[PDB]
């Protein structure tokens, strides 16, 4: 994808983690309060898969929008998932 | 989804089980012979994922309709899959 | 698709009709009480498209299951759509 | 869909209009700057289709995110499309 | 999409044309015997839609691969469709 | 699917393998340089899943076309993936 493009992934966890950290939330001044990929963890699931990078916006998890989520809630939403997770993203770096 | 809506999931097994029991089949008097989720097994894959609930109808597995399946046939169709399974469902009533 | 396979189409109406007649519904003795394609109307939209054939089962319209529909209800659901309609189907026999 | 659910539509224009008006954008004082459906025009494309309503958020158009878009920019993004437009939404009216 | 990316479009015809011309086929010496977009016709459907460009590869039409098609067969496959057509493409080089 | 149909799968690895061996690539004399399933490994991931068979063509991996791939490039593309891999295929003859 190009920056700005929507894309979706079915991401399998490794070590029961998606291998990303997130930044943002409505409680934050992070732009518009969105949830963004802060970092892909070395040798983690996201990195091995290769489609998600720092800067991508996480729009939804398993069919549910993250709109209105505080940081705590976004993290919890990502954790409260099974071994394969459906993620909807916008490609960052535009 | 709301009751009646179509949804799809890619569900990873836990210890080779999707963690759902089903009821129904053409051989039964259940509704019109359809395959429905009887229970989401505690601690299982379907429960962790959080999208599938008791009463949802399973319409297809890995791209093949369950039409005409007996109960036994549906159970075996669900078992005879790999580690991640594509499921097409209709959301049940609350 | 082969018989039994799930497929979907986005079908544009010709002169406000999808060009399919249906058979079945829970008030009939058509198998499983399902809604099936009775005919692909000559010169109509479904015929021109080429993917839908007599005997295919219509599972959903614009994201909403036809589960439990009477014949009349199914016909209305098809008719109460805009110009392009999303249809979910099961490929029929022979 | 339930409020908060992601959904997508392929919507055909009527009289070269999708038959919805929008509110919001980065510059505006509305809802985190996101783009929301303000109204569905009577007899219009979106109304006939029946899947989009006031309050839904428009996440993307033809594969491209509306993220960071101003009002004018969003309104034009919607206009510079062809006869059928792919829309990604979040169901509103919690 | 970036060059090499898969993308899909539901394209409504304008004046009964998709507004694209193609090059290639197993009877030509075009690379891989593939079918490529030769031109997008000014003011046509593809151009208004904005997602398809010269050099993109057409992988499939309405669910069917163009693998092994001669040039005339590819053209006919494109023509022998309804008012809205599902196209699977690979993004070409710019 | 029928021969020539497009299908997609989300395939989970078993013991870090997709359970398929492929043949072809631009450097080979196989077909028109495409990447094809040579075998599915007994008791492996692809076999258990049941949708991919010898002769199917792999068109893309995780959203990126295998156009122009040498064999070694194709294999590396398959390997440089996470635990669940999105594959786009054309159903082979028979």
From Swiss-Prot, chains A, B, C, D, E, F:
- Protein family: Belongs to the protein-tyrosine phosphatase family. Non-receptor class subfamily.
Gene symbol here is PTPN13
**Which residue ranges does the record assign to the PDZ domain?**
8-92
Q: What is this protein called?
A: Tyrosine-protein phosphatase non-receptor type 13
Q: Where in the cell is it found?
A: Cytoplasm, Cytoskeleton; Nucleus; Cell projection, Lamellipodium
Its annotated function is as follows: Tyrosine phosphatase which negatively regulates FAS-induced apoptosis and NGFR-mediated pro-apoptotic signaling. May regulate phosphoinositide 3-kinase (PI3K) signaling through dephosphorylation of PIK3R2.
- Which tissues does the record link to its expression? Expressed in keratinocytes (at protein level). Present in most tissues with the exception of the liver and skeletal muscle. Most abundant in lung, kidney and fetal brain.
Quaternary organization: Interacts (via the first PDZ domain) with PLEKHA1 and PLEKHA2. Interacts (via the second PDZ domain) with TNFRSF6 (Fas receptor) (via C-terminus). Interacts (via the second PDZ domain) with TRIP6 (via the third LIM domain and C-terminus). Interacts (via the third PDZ domain) with NGFR (via C-terminal SVP motif) and PKN2 (via C-terminus). Interacts (via the second or fourth PDZ domains) with PDLIM4 (via C-terminus only or via combined C-terminus and LIM domain, but not LIM domain only). Found in a complex with PDLIM4 and TRIP6.
Look up the domain of life of the source: Eukaryota
């Amino acid at each position: 994808p190009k920056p700005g493009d929507i894309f979706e992934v079915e991401l399998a966890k490794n070590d029961n983690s998606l291998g990303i950290s997130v930044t943002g939330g409505v409680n934050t001044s992070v732009r518009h309060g969105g949830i963004y990929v802060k970092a892909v963890i070395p040798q983690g699931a996201a990195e091995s898969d290769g489609r998600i990078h720092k800067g991508d916006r996480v729009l939804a998890v398993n069919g549910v929008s993250l709109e209105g989520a505080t940081h705590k809630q976004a993290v919890e939403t990502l954790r409260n998932t099974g071994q394969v997770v459906h993620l909807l993203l916008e490609k960052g770096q535009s």
